[PDB]
Design an enzyme around this catalytic site. Structure first.
Site, PDB file in Angstrom:
ATOM      1  CG  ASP A   1       9.002  -8.656   4.761  1.00 22.08           C
ATOM      2  OD1 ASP A   1       9.256  -7.506   4.348  1.00 22.08           O
ATOM      3  OD2 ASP A   1       9.355  -9.685   4.147  1.00 22.08           O
TER       4      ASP A   1
ATOM      5  CD  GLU B   1      -0.280   8.882  11.086  1.00 16.50           C
ATOM      6  OE1 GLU B   1       0.172   9.376  10.032  1.00 16.50           O
ATOM      7  OE2 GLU B   1      -1.464   9.033  11.451  1.00 16.50           O
TER       8      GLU B   1
ATOM      9  CG  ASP C   1      13.116  -9.718   6.339  1.00 10.73           C
ATOM     10  OD1 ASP C   1      13.453  -9.137   5.287  1.00 10.73           O
ATOM     11  OD2 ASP C   1      13.490 -10.873   6.631  1.00 10.73           O
TER      12      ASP C   1
ATOM     13  CG  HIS D   1       7.081 -10.958   1.327  1.00 10.76           C
ATOM     14  ND1 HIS D   1       7.036  -9.613   1.030  1.00 10.76           N
ATOM     15  CD2 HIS D   1       7.320 -11.594   0.157  1.00 10.76           C
ATOM     16  CE1 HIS D   1       7.242  -9.443  -0.264  1.00 10.76           C
ATOM     17  NE2 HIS D   1       7.418 -10.629  -0.817  1.00 10.76           N
TER      18      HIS D   1
HETATM   19 MG   LIG Z   1      10.283 -11.352   4.339  1.00 10.41          MG
END
Ligand SMILES: [Mg+2]
Ligand SMILES: [Mg+2]
EC number: 3.1.26.-
Length: 734
Positions: free
Chosen positions: A506, A544, A576, A709
């Site tokens: 994520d 990159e 994600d 996250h």
């Molecule tokens: Mg997430």
RNA sequence: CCAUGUUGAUGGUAA
RNA sequence: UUACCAUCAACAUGGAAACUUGGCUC
């Protein structure tokens, strides 16, 4: 892309099926052999020749759509109005496609929007608001009018119409009355007009404003004629105030007589009850949602003109919302030390975690507590409570080493923590009591404890410990987070298939810092999906970043070998934070380049199963109770007639939603080599939704995406630097 | 008007 | 920052429009 796993459920969407009747949708090229520069002239040229084509012509400038056959080559002629040249229009066939083919969508939507316009609905933004059927509370001179957006999309099942309600609130005092209030109270409060959305009632336009001038054009005459005359032409309006000030928008000039303020008035906001009464109307159960949708459908059904402009194209809306059957995935079994249990009907097991012992609970013998002078007693009480609850969770906690901070200044905090850490060298954790909503101190503590010196650290704000009768819960949660941050293991769930490594990713998109685009990466390194290995990649260019991701994957695999002595055969990557447009690109270029790093190891052929998880979706699901609609139960998966027609995906409702319509999540499978059945991938994702070690219960996305996250947020917002290597063997980032 | 992020306010839930 | 969930606000980043029998500023 269908399977059987549990008891069926008779759901119902906010979707209306559109029945295409004929098979006649015919694309046509249009071209002109002499040059015509004006687009409007091309439209008129089509208009005069419409008799041969018919009156169902839809035309954007270069391609024409017609539901009736013409000869392959059609040559028509006419005269230009400007150059008087013999313009010879040529029209040719292109192809033949089914009337629901995803290519004829973007003018079918125009047809529906016209059908709405025939029904007397305004066109603010992209929504249709009905003025007459509005509710007036009048407590603060407030009338709320409702509305509902509606768009036609195509899914595997055909042409569906997604319609959903959105309410808008308006006053009945004009801005002129408020300006009169400002004048009598004594342009002192005209300054608040900035940033205020204003409306015209008849709603031919919506506007926003920056400032107001007092004497520019109150009595003046507009450009061709008097001000009142032009507003009489536009609205037939008589102005009460001759000396009305004039509002400035950008330069456009707007007026206060018809300008009505929108949104909740600022004074109302302070009002608690009022704000509570308004939320009652704004927030809707499934029953009222379906009632409004049925109101829309009946409104279209009763007007014959809307139906005729609909049925010119052979389409016909149905009389009821779409009814779908989806299955309820069985309930999982959550494991603890010496005990295990099946989850409850609401998917929440907060009490069970705290009452019973956890899997691994390493002892705490050396830890330091840093607090300021103003929080003596509470802090001491906290420690006592942290001892009292320690036993049920299954931890051994010794009394802390108290450190008393002379002040709140951050230098003292940092210096004291550094000194104690340096001298002892055995402080397993640092606990800091922050005296207020002090962001800089939180950042400084986390930086010192996660990059300069490797100690896990927890922060406890004074407000949270301030309230008795809630101290037991905060103690329980703080101690569980402490246990997680030391390489502990709280609860676990069985996995039926053997030898898998779940990976997640994520991204954190920087609002302002030049698109650093920190990407999390969490990969299990244990057979029970219980120990996690986490890294962070600080690369701005998208081209990159794949190199560093390849490095991350090979390092993760090497550690998997070194800690288990056998590499996995399957890999599942819950990518994600990818927009729908980028999905195809991610399926085309990024995934194979990431795969290509497996040549670093010999005779290793894995089977990747890549997902993409996007939380934001616009389809709602209602469970069909006999006499109204209710909120769907958690753990419902649907893949019939609402999923897409190029991928293999499903919509999953996993978490517990208290009230109202439920919003599932979309699982696009952009690569599948392991040949898992749809049932297996569905159940596996539902199992992985239960393994978040911060909130005891079910979450929306799988646990690795949530962890990635959290790690990206911590590393990009707080630390601004990559954490230390030795911490990344545990969930240090919680 | 959309998304993507934050920053707050209010209201819930958690012995 | 005890941890989740809603609703409403603001800001900062990128975009887009309504025309369709062709939206439309005043
Ligand atoms: Mg997430
Ligand atoms: Mg935390």
């Amino acid at each position: 892309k269908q399977g059987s796993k549990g008891t069926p459920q008779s759901l119902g969407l906010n979707l209306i099926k559109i029945q295409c009747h004929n098979e006649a949708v015919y694309q046509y090229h249009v071209t002109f052999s002499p040059s015509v520069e004006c687009k409007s002239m091309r439209f008129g040229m089509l208009k005069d020749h419409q008799s041969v084509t018919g009156n169902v012509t839809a035309f954007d400038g270069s391609i024409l759509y017609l539901p009736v056959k013409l000869q392959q080559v059609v040559e028509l002629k006419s005269q230009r109005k400007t150059d008087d040249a013999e313009i010879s229009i040529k029209i040719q066939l292109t192809k033949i496609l089914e009337p629901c083919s995803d290519l004829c969508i973007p003018f079918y939507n125009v047809v529906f929007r016209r059908v709405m316009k025939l029904l007397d609905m305004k066109l603010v933004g992209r929504n249709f608001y009905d003025p007459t059927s509005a509710m007036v509370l009048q407590q603060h001179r407030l009338q709320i009018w409702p509305g509902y957006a509606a768009s036609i999309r195509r899914t595997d099942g055909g042409l569906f119409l997604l319609a959903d309600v959105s309410h808008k609130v308006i006053r009945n005092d004009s801005v002129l009355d408020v300006m009169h209030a400002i004048y009598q109270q004594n342009d002192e409060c005209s300054k608040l007009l900035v940033g205020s959305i204003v409306i015209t009632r008849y709603n031919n336009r919506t506007y926003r404003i920056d400032d107001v001038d007092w004497n520019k054009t109150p009595k003046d005459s507009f450009v061709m004629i008097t001000f009142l005359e032009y507003y009489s032409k536009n609205y037939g309006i008589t102005v009460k105030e001759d000396d009305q000030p004039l509002l400035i928008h950008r330069e456009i000039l707007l007026l206060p007589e018809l300008s009505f303020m929108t949104g909740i008035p600022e004074k109302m906001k302070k009002d608690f009850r009022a704000m509570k009464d308004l939320t009652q109307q704004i927030n809707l159960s499934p029953k009222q949602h379906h009632g409004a949708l049925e109101c829309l459908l009946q409104r279209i059904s009763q007007n014959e003109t809307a139906s005729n402009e609909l049925t010119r194209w052979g389409l016909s809306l149905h009389k009821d919302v779409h009814k779908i059957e989806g299955r309820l995935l069985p309930m999982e079994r959550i494991n603890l030390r010496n005990t295990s249990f099946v989850t409850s009907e609401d998917l929440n097991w907060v009490k069970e975690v705290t009452r019973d012992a956890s899997i691994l609970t390493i002892p705490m013998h050396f830890w330091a507590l840093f607090y300021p002078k103003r929080a003596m007693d509470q802090a001491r009480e906290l420690v006592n409570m942290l001892e009292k609850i320690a036993g049920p969770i299954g931890m051994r906690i010794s009394p802390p080493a108290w450190v008393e901070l002379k002040d709140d200044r951050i230098e003292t905090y940092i210096r004291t923590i550094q000194s104690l850490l340096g001298v002892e060298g055995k402080i397993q954790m640092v606990v800091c009591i922050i005296m207020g909503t002090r962001d800089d101190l939180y950042g400084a503590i986390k930086k010192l404890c996660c990059v300069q010196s490797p100690v896990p650290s927890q922060v406890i704000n004074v407000r949270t410990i301030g309230q008795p009768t809630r101290l037991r819960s905060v103690a329980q949660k703080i101690l569980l987070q402490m246990n997680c941050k030391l390489g502990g293991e709280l609860w676990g769930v069985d996995i039926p298939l053997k030898q898998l490594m779940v990976i997640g990713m994520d991204v954190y998109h920087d609002p302002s810092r030049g698109m650093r685009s920190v990407v999390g990466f969490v990969a299990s390194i244990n057979l029970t999906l219980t120990k996690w290995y986490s890294r962070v990649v600080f690369q701005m260019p998208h081209q990159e970043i794949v190199d560093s991701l390849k490095l991350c994957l090979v390092g993760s695999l090497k550690k998997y070998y070194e800690v288990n002595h056998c590499l996995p055969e399957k890999i599942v990557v819950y990518r994600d934070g990818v927009s729908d447009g980028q999905l195809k690109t991610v399926a085309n270029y990024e995934i194979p380049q990431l795969q290509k790093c497996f040549e670093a190891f010999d005779n290793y052929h894995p089977k990747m199963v890549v997902f993409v998880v996007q939380k934001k979706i616009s389809t709602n699901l209602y469970l069909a109770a006999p006499d109204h609609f209710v909120t769907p139960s958690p753990g419902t998966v649907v893949d019939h007639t609402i999923t897409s027609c190029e991928w293999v995906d499903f919509y999953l409702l996993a978490h517990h939603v208290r009230q109202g319509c439920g919003i599932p999540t979309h699982y696009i499978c952009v690569l599948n080599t392991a040949n898992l059945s749809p049932d297996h991938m569905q159940r596996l994702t539902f199992k992985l939704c239960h393994m978040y070690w911060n909130w005891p219960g079910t979450i929306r996305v799988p646990a690795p995406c949530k962890y990635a996250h959290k790690l990206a947020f911590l590393s990009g917002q707080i630390l601004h630097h990559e954490p230390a290597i030795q911490l990344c063997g545990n969930l240090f980032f919680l």
